[PDB]
């Protein structure tokens, strides 16, 4: 709905997607309708990004949450610097946090079970601060994203 552009909702989407990538079970009936649609398309994109940018991503060592955060912000700053926002770009934010959590799982010097909660937090910060107004104006997750990305 109208308020699904606020932090708590976005943070839950970002956390849900990292739990999907890490194959962590979140108990209950399941993720929301938004998350269910987002996880499929974000994962498809993630696999294509991993393949297309494999040589680039081989030079990427994500050894700490602080490196993950600066790298994420550097990548997102450049991706969005032309001022354009669309749902495809928003999907790539989720795909990229999935890449970061996989690199951390292998490379993090001092891993902690709550790491995915810290990554998804700064991801939600970026989405809210840089795309939240556009999300709201375009129908939010329920009337915008899901309507365009759910099955016909």
């Amino acid at each position: 709905g109208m308020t699904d552009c606020e932090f708590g909702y976005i943070y839950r989407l970002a956390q849900d997607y990292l739990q999907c990538v890490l194959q962590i079970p979140q108990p209950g009936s399941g993720p929301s309708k938004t998350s269910r649609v987002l996880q499929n398309v974000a994962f498809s994109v993630q696999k294509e990004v991993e393949k297309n940018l494999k040589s680039c991503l081989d030079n990427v060592n994500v050894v700490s949450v602080d490196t993950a955060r600066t790298l994420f912000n550097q990548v997102m700053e450049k991706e969005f610097e032309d001022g354009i926002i669309n749902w495809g770009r928003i999907v790539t934010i989720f795909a990229f946090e999935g890449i970061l959590i996989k690199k951390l799982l292998r490379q993090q010097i001092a891993p902690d079970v709550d790491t995915y909660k810290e990554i998804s937090y700064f991801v939600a910060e970026f989405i809210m601060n840089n795309t939240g107004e556009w999300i709201r104006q375009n129908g939010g997750w329920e009337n915008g994203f899901v309507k365009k990305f759910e099955p016909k």
Binding site: V41, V45, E48, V49, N52, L53, C56, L57, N59, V60, L71, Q74, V75, M76, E77, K78, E79, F80, E81, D82, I84, N86, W87, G88, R89, V91, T92, F96, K148, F149
Partner: peptide
């Protein structure tokens, strides 16, 4: 250099993806 290259390439892939849903 790598982060900046990744960002530009994510933009390219995102806009191609987006065109399949924004007609």
């Amino acid at each position: 250099q790598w982060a900046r290259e990744i960002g530009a390439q994510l933009r390219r892939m995102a806009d191609d993806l987006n065109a399949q849903y924004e007609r």
